[PDB]
Structures are given as structure tokens and as C-alpha cells.
Symmetry: C3
Subunit: 345 residues, 3 copies
């Protein structure tokens, strides 16, 4: 009855993004996606703490879906019988039935097919939402991702000029609530159900034990730093389904930032730090101007350095001494310096 | 000496709003309001927990006042002698004397009359502010509401086009700080004064025990869901006098959102989730496109589902299968499905 | 090799700001600043609680630096041998090398000279960032300030009209994490290193013990209230390097607010309360219209009244009864008043 071409999309694990066109002259299609729920224990920090997670497609965050305005998105949500709980999906991009949640509740061993029209442009959260207290628990257990609905003409600067990215990354930030024992050590559990009561108690106090990108402290540092090159315009999509965040690229800026994430609004320019409201996705474009390591953080630095929420970019290219230079390397304070006369002493 | 017509306004309890014109061709008037402080015990959650509250006009939030730009607002604040504490009022809409607080301190048995000129358009918080530590305590005990100052031409989209709402609701969100005993159960008290010391200790840790709309968990669910119809443009005013919130309409959007709440600024379009800075009111317009239940939450889902901060809309009308449809109802996973080959396993 | 004039700037302690031009017809210069790290015990509240602080130039916040777009900023960072730890500096205004942090690590007894080009307009945080867990600890110990990069034509309203301030103040807000003993009293320490382990435990819970302006509760009240006069347009720069804030001027407004702090974006008008994302600076202009005391707060009123985050302005001039007036002073409730008939009773 909807007589449009169908196109199957193969998702990829974050922070990477499946192939897509930015601008397109194709007309609306039915874009077909499959999301498979996977409940499993996962490692969430550098000390090896484990966690009873619930995911779409085995990752935290779930994968980024990319479509264009006016496409229809036909999602097969699958809940294999190796899982123990019912699940569903709420697309913040969609209109009606609790985002789809009221049409996608499935028991282990079931699947369901939801179609929603992509009438709203931007980046948007999707997440599980079974009902009642299960809603926050499934979300903070990992069941959230994002979808991007691009304008058919691609992005623009809000002032009539096209913007094109050379690279895209999806940073899903996750607040986790991990019980501790009387000795103060994180507790391990053999199933999500066994974890629940203790976890709910931590959730109620609204203070995460971990705040991570791509599912664990250190996930996007080390060998898994994000690559870029001087001159590239990089789109960084950031989502947080449950709790606020304040992204910042250390040594960079947000050249164009949609912090509320919706491309019908002009981006802000030249930001230092932006703000992702819990329950949303936002996006920032930055053209790299200097090589080296950059850290990408939430700028509650306690969260960034001590709870897990730091990623790295490794950027190749040539240093620009006009923008920044070390005029004099560290040296002993001159003996004839006069700092004892300064106003603050 | 101010020679303008006087118009008495009868307030109504939230989430409803007293009758008013959106656009008007009337000139400035003196709009007369009465607010009566009421200290009383109130029920704040579904388990029947009680709370020593302080209110304007017996409700949390206090009622929404609606005027137009250039009106004068003449408020009689009354503190009956059945109350035990002094009170005052701070209008964030007003200019001077600590919002009016420095001109309205009244003891039990007194009343005072304040007039302020509505020179600033938008939605704004009002709240009690007696002085010092009493300021946060009176506010988080319930003494806060909002006022809307409409442009005389009504709302517009920031791009020269009038916007008109068919319905308006006021959602006041309240962070509450309820002591617990050694057994972990919420404590009851016989007066606000007896509650204070234990309550201040909870306040100091900055984590509410409850986050509620219209004064209690479940207030706007059940029989008291908010009504609307497909096609109606609904204005949802949201205030929070002490603490941030991130509103979201599950299954909907914010078509036009003034998240900082001030109508001299163009609204943002097509938001998923917005942000109410503690100490402010904001507003969102949404035209309903689908019937059914919608949940309206703060999108810290722990707060929403576990601390009280969920409302419902019940929307009548006809479902639009073009926007969203269940293509296939829940069914067993096909035996010949191949999910073991998916990239994430 | 950079052949520009050099101009040495003498910094002053906050909340005051060194002398500068708003609009200028001078061309780019090399603007020379010196920042000296000082580790010392400081008093942070009205009860005399002490704290092992780390500062730039002896103050919390560090001083406001002011330059113009296209200037080069050449900073000599000095770490005297009376200090115990290494330090560095990250300018959110700068491009490359972790904001400068990767080029400025200095041991006690060393200094370094960094030059960065002021290519981005706005107010921006600067802060120490040595590496790893030392990053949040140095910041929340006090090592953060701000820099303002003005357009050469000065500020404008985003709609082609120049804005000029008569006065400028810099409000640096600081979240502090002070351990308590088993009796609940704040603990004192003899060095930052001795404080660290207990302090990190408080930091991990993400709830400050104190939230202060200009380094201590009460710093900008009393004798040190901020002065202004009716009619003056005052720029209030607000920074927070680690944690969100929601500024509000009680009895006033933000006439023009850059809450993300970047002057390539038009300001919002007529705000009640704005939002400083942790890790940023923002700015608000307000033209005073009434004399008297104003309080300037973060509008988590618990933070404002109970954790230290209130400043005052003392404004001289003549009261305007058109904007606000006490129509009737406090009086007994009339005997023939009818309040028992009101809808809420
Ligand atoms: Cu689920
Ligand atoms: Cu949601
Ligand atoms: Cu009161
Ligand atoms: Cu206020
Ligand atoms: Cu340092
Ligand atoms: Cu930083």
C-alpha cells in the first residue's frame, strides 16, 4: 500500500556510522533496519568492572541510523529467546504511540515491525521504554541509541550556505549506576534481574558511578582513538538518553553546533562547550586546524577524568605556529625576576 | 494617580489557566490578583507520603497569572493568621526591590498590595523569598508559580507569523526534600517548623526525594490526564523555581519552543526535549497529530518514572497510519531467520 | 618573526577587570600577560572554613584577561618553587595542543611562554589541566579563570546595533568539595597533597559542599557588594569551569544574554535566568532601572543561600514608581475580608 522503493541498511557499531548520502536527489524510500536486543554482561571500566547490560545490537550506544526527511523507516525489532525481559523501542524522531513504544512491546522469542515517517530533521534519541520503573532501568542499562534525519539537501549553516562533513562519529554517552558492597567495591551479578534491586537504589540517588562513551571508560582512547586530519570537517553526534552532558573538544571548538540537535534551527557558531539535554541528541561540526591529540569530554571534569567520560582524537597534519606556539620552553624562573612585587602577593 | 481601568482576575488551580485573550486591542489596564498563602500538610506521592507544604492559593504550583505587555499587575498578597511564618513574593517578571520581595514581607495576620508594570514578555517564575535560608526552604516547600506576559498581538513564530493556541496547560514542577528515618521510610511531621532541620539536611545534598508535577506523583495521570484533540495547538508552560528540568512529550515534539521562556526571542522548532533552567519558566507549542496516550516527562527517566515526574495527555481523534503504523504485530521469530550472522554477535 | 607591537597588560583581581578599549581602531598586537600559580590555604565560607586552594594569581577565579579578535596572546605562566605540584594552562579560546596544556607543563621553579592567536570571539574559560585525575582536582581547587576576546568593533545586539557597557564585572563561580569528619565538621589539612584522597572521595559523589563567587561565601556581599547606578549598562561575565550554573539577577533581567558566551551569536533578550554550561563562560548585559540592593545568584536557591552562591549589587539612583510601587504597606487583614470563600479552601 505504500508504494515506495525499499532499501535495506546494514548498521555498524558506534562510533562509526553506516554509509549514507548527505545531500540526495533520490526521493523518499522505505529504509529498512533491524535492531536485535541483546542482554549480556559487559566490561565498563579500566579496572575491569562488569555490568549487567541491555543493548540494541550488542553495543552501548545502539548504532546510529541515518535517513533523510520524508523517508519512511521500517524497523524490525527482535527480542531473542536467550533474553529474559520484554523490550520495545521509542523513537524521539517519530510521531504517535509513545514514539513507537506502544506498538513494539515484545517478549523473548518475538519480533515486531514498526514503520515511522521521518517528518522531523535532526539527530534524535531512540531508547527502550517497557513501562513504569522498567523505563529508566532499561535505558540506563544501555538500551539507547540515536537516529539522524538529514535534510535532502544535506546540512546548512542557517544562513543559506551548505555544510558538508568529511567524517562523522557518533558518541553515545551513558550514565551507569553500579552497586557497591559494604567494603566499597563494585558488586558483580549473574543476571540483570539479580542486579535490579541494588541498582535501583543507586539510580534513586541520581548520581552515576560511571559516565562513559561507547560503553566503557577508555573505549575511545588508546588504540581506539578517533582519527582525523587537519582540514577535515568532522560531525560529532552526541547523545544522552537520561542525563545532561556538556561536550567540549579540548584544543578545539564547535564551529557549528546544534546543541538541541534539530536542523530546522540555525546552529550556533564558535562554541567552547555545548549542552546535551538528557533525553536528546545534539551535533557539532568542527574543521580541524592543528594536528595532535585532542581529548573530547563532558566538561564536568570529575566525570571526564574520574568516571570515564573522555575520548581522544588523533589528528594527522602540520602544526600551525601562527595559531599557537611555545615561545619559550620550560626554563628556570630567572633569578632577576621580580614576582614578589605582584599585586596579589 | 495611575488612571487606567481596573480588571479583577479570578485565578484557577493548575494545570488549568484563567480565561484570557491571546491577542487584544484593549489598552493597558491594572490587572488585579489576589494570592493567599496557605501552609498545610499535603500528600505528595502514590504511597500517601505527607509533606509540610507552603503554598500560594493552596496549590503546588501556585496558579498561572496571565496579563499583556504594558499592563500593570496589582497583587494583594495575604498571609492569614492561621499560618505560622512570614512570607513575601518575588516576581521574575518585575523590575526592582528584589522582584517585589523587599516590598511584600508580611507576618501572619497581614496583607500587602504590590503593583508591577509588565514590561517584559514571556513566562516567568514567581516565588516566596523571605530572606537567607528561608528563601530555598519556602520555595522547595511549594511557594512558587508563574506569570505569563503575552504580547498584545499574541504569540508569533519569530518570523512574522502569528501563532494561536487552542488550549493551554501550566505544568509546575517541584523538587521536594523529604527526610527519612533510620529504617529508610519517609518521616512525617506536625508542622513546617518541626520539619525544617531534618529537611535542610536533605536539601544540602541537592538530591530531591520526589520530583512532581502539580504537587504530587500521579497528579496528572489517571483520571486527571490532560485532554486534547488531534489538530489542536496546545501551549504547555513549564516552570521550575529551584532546579533544572528537561521536558519531553513522548510520541510528540515541541513544534515551537521558547525554552528560556521569553517571547522577544524566536522559538526553536521541532525539538525532542527542551531545558528549563532552574529559576525560570519556558513554553512549548505542539499541534497534536495522533490520538492516544502521551506521557509528558522530565527526561531524566529516573526522575520521571521513579520520583514522580510524569503527566499524561489523553488525545481523541483518528490514527494516521502514514505517520506511524505497526506493519507486523508481535510474532515468533521466524525459524529461518539468520540473526546469528549479524555483525555484533 | 611575528612583527607586531607588544603591549604588557597588568591584571587585576576579580571581580574587577583590567582597563581596556571596547571598540578599537588599533590593529592586532601581541598582548602580554603573566600568570603566577599560587598554592595556598584560603578561607571559603562565613564560618571560617579553610581550604587547600590552588590559584592563578592568588585569586579564585583567576583574573579576567581582555583582548580583541586577531590579537596574539603571549602568556608567561610561572610556577614558583614554593609550590609543590606541576601546573599548566588550557585556554578554551585557543586552538591546538589541548588549549595550550600540552605546551605549558611546568614544575615548581619553572616558567613557560605560550602564544595563542585570538581567532574566536566571546568569553572563554581558562584552567589548569596537568593530566588524568589531576585535571578535575586542580580545577576544583581553584585553578580556573576566563578570557574575553572582543570584536574590534565592540559588542553588538546581533541585529546591527552597537552595545556598550558602562561597567564590567567578572563573576567566577567555584564548586568546592571539602571533606567532613565523622562528626560532620569540615576537615582542615596542612597541604593540598594531604587533602587529596579525602577530597577525591567527595568529588566522586558530584555534590559540592560549597558553591561560591569570587572564592568564598559572602565575598561579594557586605562591604564588597558590586556598585552600579541607575541607567548604567553593566556587563556581567560569569564562568564555571566544572559544573553548570543558572545565573539570575533578583529584581532585574538579562537585557542581552550570550549564555553560551560567544559573540558571533546574537544574544537572547529579556531573560529571567540563564544557563552557564560547566566548562564555559557566558555574559549578560543589563541596564539598571531601579536603585537598591539586588542579589545575583545561581537559581538553585539551595546553592545560593545555603552553599555560598550569592552576590549583591548596590545601585544608587531614584526609584521609579511606574515600574513598581508598594500600593499599600503591610496592614492587618480587613475584618470584612471574605477569603474563606476562595476556590482553593
Ligand atoms: Cu528493554
Ligand atoms: Cu524518551
Ligand atoms: Cu513563604
Ligand atoms: Cu528568583
Ligand atoms: Cu594546576
Ligand atoms: Cu577545559
Amino acid at each position: 500500500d505504500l508504494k515506495l522503493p525499499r532499501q535495506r541498511v546494514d548498521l555498524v557499531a558506534p562510533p562509526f556510522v553506516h554509509v549514507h548520502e548527505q545531500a540526495t536527489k533520490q526521493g523518499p524510500k522505505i529504509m529498512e533496519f533491524k535492531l536485535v536486543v541483546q542482554e549480556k554482561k559487559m566490561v565498563i571500566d579500566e579496572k575491569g568492572t562488569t555490568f549487567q547490560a541491555m543493548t540494541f545490537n550488542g553495543s552501548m550506544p545502539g548504532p546510529l541510523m541515518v535517513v533523510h526527511e520524508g523517508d519512511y523507516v521500517e524497523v524490525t525489532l527482535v527480542n531473542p529467546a536467550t533474553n529474559t525481559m520484554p523490550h520495545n523501542i521509542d523513537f524521539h524522531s517519530a510521531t504517535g504511540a509513545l514514539g513507537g513504544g506502544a506498538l513494539t512491546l515484545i517478549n523473548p522469542g518475538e519480533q515486531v515491525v514498526l514503520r515511522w515517517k521521518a517528518t522531523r530533521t535532526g539527530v534524535f534519541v531512540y531508547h527502550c521504554a517497557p513501562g513504569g520503573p522498567m523505563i529508566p532501568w532499561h535505558v540506563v542499562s544501555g538500551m539507547n541509541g540515536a537516529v539522524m534525519v538529514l535534510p535532502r539537501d544535506g546540512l546548512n549553516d542557517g544562513h543559506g550556505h551548505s555544510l558538508r562533513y568529511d567524517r562523522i562519529y557518533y558518541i553515545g554517552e551513558q550514565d551507569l549506576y553500579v552497586p557497591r558492597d559494604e567494603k566499597g567495591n563494585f558488586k558483580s551479578y549473574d543476571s540483570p534481574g539479580e542486579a535490579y534491586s541494588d541498582t535501583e537504589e543507586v539510580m534513586r540517588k541520581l548520581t552515576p558511578t560511571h559516565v562513559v562513551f561507547n560503553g566503557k571508560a577508555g573505549a575511545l582512547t588508546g588504540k581506539n582513538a578517533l582519527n582525523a586530519n587537519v582540514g577535515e570537517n568532522v560531525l560529532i553526534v552526541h547523545s544522552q538518553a537520561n542525563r545532561d552532558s556538556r561536550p567540549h573538544l579540548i584544543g578545539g571548538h564547535g564551529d557549528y553546533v546544534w546543541e538541541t540537535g534539530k536542523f530546522s534551527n540555525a546552529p550556533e557558531t564558535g562554541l567552547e562547550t555545548w549542552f546535551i539535554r538528557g533525553g536528546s541528541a545534539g551535533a557539532a561540526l568542527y574543521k580541524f586546524l592543528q594536528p595532535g591529540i585532542y581529548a573530547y569530554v563532558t566538561h564536568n571534569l570529575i566525570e571526564a577524568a574520574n568516571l570515564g567520560a573522555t575520548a581522544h582524537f588523533k589528528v594527522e597534519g602540520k602544526w600551525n605556529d601562527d595559531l599557537m606556539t611555545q615561545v619559550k620552553a620550560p626554563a628556570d624562573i630567572p633569578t632577576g625576576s621580580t614576582n614578589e612585587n605582584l599585586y596579589f602577593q
